[PDB]
Structure formats: structure tokens, C-alpha cells
Amino acid sequence: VAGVSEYELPEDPRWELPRDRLVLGKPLGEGQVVLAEAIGLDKDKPNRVTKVAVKMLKSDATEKDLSDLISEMEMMKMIGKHKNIINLLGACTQDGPLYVIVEYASKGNLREYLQARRPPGEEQLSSKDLVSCAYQVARGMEYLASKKCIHRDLAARNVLVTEDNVMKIADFGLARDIHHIDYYKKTTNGRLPVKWMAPEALFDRIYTHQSDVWSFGVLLWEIFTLGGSPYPGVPVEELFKLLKEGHRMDKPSNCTNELYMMMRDCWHAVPSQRPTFKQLVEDLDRIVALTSNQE
Ligand SMILES: CN1CCN(c2ccc3[nH]c(-c4c(N)c5c(F)cccc5[nH]c4=O)nc3c2)CC1
Ligand SMILES: [Cl-]
Ligand SMILES: [Cl-]
Ligand SMILES: [Cl-]
Numbered sequence: 001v002a003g004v005s006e007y008e009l010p011e012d013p014r015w016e017l018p019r020d021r022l023v024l025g026k027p028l029g030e031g032q033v034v035l036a037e038a039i040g041l042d043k044d045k046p047n048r049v050t051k052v053a054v055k056m057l058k059s060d061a062t063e064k065d066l067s068d069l070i071s072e073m074e075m076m077k078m079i080g081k082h083k084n085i086i087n088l089l090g091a092c093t094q095d096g097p098l099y100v101i102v103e104y105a106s107k108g109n110l111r112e113y114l115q116a117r118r119p120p121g122e123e124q125l126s127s128k129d130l131v132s133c134a135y136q137v138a139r140g141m142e143y144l145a146s147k148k149c150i151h152r153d154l155a156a157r158n159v160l161v162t163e164d165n166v167m168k169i170a171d172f173g174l175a176r177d178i179h180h181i182d183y184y185k186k187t188t189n190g191r192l193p194v195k196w197m198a199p200e201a202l203f204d205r206i207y208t209h210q211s212d213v214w215s216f217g218v219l220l221w222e223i224f225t226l227g228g229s230p231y232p233g234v235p236v237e238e239l240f241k242l243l244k245e246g247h248r249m250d251k252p253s254n255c256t257n258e259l260y261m262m263m264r265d266c267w268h269a270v271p272s273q274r275p276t277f278k279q280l281v282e283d284l285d286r287i288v289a290l291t292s293n294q295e
Contacts, residue, residue, distance in 0.1 A: 003059055005066055009093040015077065017041065017090040017101065024054065031058050035104060041089060052089055055100040066098065068175045073100045075173035079147050084140030086160060086170045105160030105168055110137075111189070113161045114227035128293035130223055131259070135284040136167035141216060142277040144172055145209050152176060152207050154215035155196045156222040157187060178205050183236050192239075195230045199243050200271060210271035216280065217266025224255040258287065 017038065025035040036054045040046035055072075057065055076088035092099040107113055110133070117125050125133075137159055144151060151158075151172045160168045183194050198214035200206045218230055230249060231239060248267055251260040262283065268274045275283070 003057070003061075003097050006063055009070065009098065011094060012077075012091070015088070015091045016094065017092055019092045019094075019096055019099075022052075022054065022092065022099065022101070023049075028053060032056055036101070038090070038101060041101075050089075051104045051106070052101050053086075053104045055102060056097060069098060069100060071175040072173040073098075075149075076100075076102075079144070079149055079173065082140060082143040083166065084136050084168055085143065085172060086168045103162075103168060105170075106163040107161040107165070109157050110159035110161055110167065111156040111222065111227045114156065114223065118226045125226075126293045127254075128288065128291045130254075131284065131288050131291050133167055134220055134223055135281070135288050137169065137219065138216065138277055138280045138284050140167065140169040141212065142281050144169065145212070145277045149173070150207050150209060151212050151215070152178070152201075153193065153196070154212050154219060155193070156219055156227065157189070159219070178207065191229055192236065194236060194239060195234075198271070199269075202240075202243070208271060209277070210274050213266050213274045213277065213280070214271075216277070217263045218249075220259065220263050220266065221249055221252065224252040224259065226254075228252070 021039045021041075023037040023039070025037065027033070028035050032055070034054045034056070036052050037049040038052045039049050041050045041052070042048065055069065057069060073088065073091060079085075081087050086103045086105070088100070088102055090101040092101075114125075116122055141151070141154065149172055151169070153171065153174070153176075154169070158170045160170050162168065181193075184192075186192055194202060196215045196218045198208075198211035200208075201211040201214075221230060222228060231242070234242065246269065248264060251257075251263075262275075262280070265275050266280075
């Protein structure tokens with residue numbers, strides 16, 4: 001019935017915020033995700049406005065779309081909070097369309113953030129900064145892994161950056177039918193998501209923490225190329241042939257042998273032999289400390 005659900009959503013007082021406390025703003029992504037101001041999110045501080053992102057359905061959406069948004073909200077409740085993931089902040093579920101209120105990242109996704117900061121052909125990033133960005137993403141993933149969550153689409157596009165340059169993993173709670181994914185469908189930027197997938201996920205559709213580590217390897221490569229496009233110009237069929245032959249991307253120019261070996265370890269052909277996010281956090285912590293910020 002238009003945008004009204006055939007079913008009705010159960011109340012959850014742990015998370016419910018009155019609709020009139022949410023001042024809706026401009027679109028951020030599509031859909032749909034919109035910037036809003038939330039008044040009195042914290043019940044201790046009722047006079048404060050907090051900038052938040054709000055997920056909601058488009059007028060087109062079906063009961064299945066609603067079901068998927070409810071599922072993401074419920075998984076976010078279960079997973080709990082961490083500094084390096086996008087956290088659930090509240091919901092409006094009653095007497096109107098479902099709003100899922102989550103953290104706002106004012107500097108947008110990591111791919112654009114990195115690209116905007118390439119030297120001109122915007123302040124440049126030091127080696128330490130790039131390695132700290134990798135560190136934070138690995139910490140977010142270590143948390144998610146510890147909570148038994150497999151992301152399935154880890155990539156710079158799904159990492160968001162806050163006003164204080166905190167990296168936050170986004171979209172870890174999405175319901176996806178991996179049988180139905182279009183290998184030829186592209187991101188809005190025109191790149192192919194198959195280029196982040198482990199061979200076992202790609203060929204046999206087996207998704208594991210180990211396949212997420214493969215994706216993290218590609219993400220590391222994205223970071224040290226300042227937002228480079230993996231396997232540029234390569235179509236799906238040729239990607240499959242490259243992976244069956246054991247091809248691996250070349251070492252980026254602005255990158256140490258140790259970090260490249262980390263990337264290659266993430267792309268181990270045998271999944272059991274890849275490092276764990278726990279180990280990656282440990283190795284990256286040591287490297288951050290030993291890497292120069294120039295000065
Ligand atoms: C100066 N500035 C440049 C970066 N600018 C920007 C652009 C797009 C942006 N998207 C989000 C965002 C999400 N797309 C998002 C999601 F898809 C799921 C869950 C939470 C989310 N939180 C967000 O904050 N922030 C953005 C900032 C706008 C202004
Ligand atoms: Cl509906
Ligand atoms: Cl918590
Ligand atoms: Cl991308």
C-alpha cells in the first residue's frame with residue numbers, strides 16, 4: 001500500500017527515536033542514505049543536535065527491500081559498537097517509513113579521500129598516514145571477525161572517513177543473495193566488484209573470514225596507489241583467466257617490500273595460509289610505529 005508495509009514493525013525501546021527529533025537533509029548516496037540532524041540522540045543531552053546518516057527505502061521499494069533493511073538493522077544491533085565501524089545510533093520504526101540512523105562520515109569514502117590527496121599533475125599523505133589508515137581498517141575487520149561477521153564486499157568504497165580522519169567500515173550487515181550477484185554489474189564509479197573477491201568466493205561462492213582477508217589485500221593495494229583501480233581495463237572473463245594462472249597485481253610505487261609482502265600474503269592461493277585480521281593488526285601496529293611521517 002504505497003510505502004506502507006503489509007506487516008508492521010515491532011517496537012524496540014532500546015533504539016527508538018521519535019520522528020520529530022530527526023531533521024532530514026540532503027542525499028549522501030543512492031537508495032537511499034541522507035544526512036540529517038538528530039535532536040537529543042543522547043537522552044542525557046536533549047538540547048544537542050548530532051549530524052547523522054539515515055538509511056531509508058525509496059518509493060519504488062518492495063516488502064523484500066524492507067525485509068533487507070530490517071535485517072541490516074537487526075544485525076547491527078547484535079554486532080555492537082566499535083570505533084572503526086559505522087555504528088547503529090537509532091531507528092524510527094513506528095507510524096511512518098522505516099529510518100535506520102547510523103554514523104555520519106563527513107569526508108566520504110576512502111577511495112575518493114585518497115584520490116583527492118594525490119600530488120597535482122588535498123594536503124598530501126605521509127607514509128605513516130597511509131599505514132595508519134590500513135591499521136584502522138584492519139582493526140575494524142578484526143572486531144567484525146571476532147563477532148563472526150563476514151563482510152563479503154570489503155573495499156575502499158565501503159570504508160568511510162570521519163571529520164577527524166577515523167576510518168569506519170560500512171555496509172558489513174547487508175543481506176546479499178550471493179547466488180544472484182551480477183558478475184558484470186559495476187559500481188557507480190564504473191569498476192567491477194569481482195576484482196576484490198577471493199578465487200574461492202568468485203569461482204565456488206565460498207565466503208569466509210579468509211576471503212575477506214583477500215579483499216583486504218586488494219584494499220591495501222588501493223591505499224598505496226592512492227585510490228588506484230585494480231586490474232584496469234580487464235574484463236570479467238580475462239580476470240578469471242588471470243586468477244586461474246595465479247596472476248597477482250604488481251607492487252605499487254609508493255610502498256615498501258614489507259607491505260607488498262603483506263599484500264601477497266593476503267592473496268595466498270591456499271585460504272588457510274593467509275594471515276588473520278588479528279595478525280594483520282599486530283603487524284601493521286609494528287609498521288606504523290617504525291614508519292616515518294617524514295618528521
Ligand atoms: C565536503 N564533503 C565531501 C565528502 N562528502 C560526503 C559524500 C558522500 C558521503 N556519504 C557518506 C555516508 C554514507 N554513504 C554512508 C552509507 F552508505 C552507509 C552508512 C553510513 C554512511 N555514512 C555516511 O556518512 N558520507 C559522505 C560525505 C560530502 C561533503
Ligand atoms: Cl513496503
Ligand atoms: Cl555495545
Ligand atoms: Cl571502487
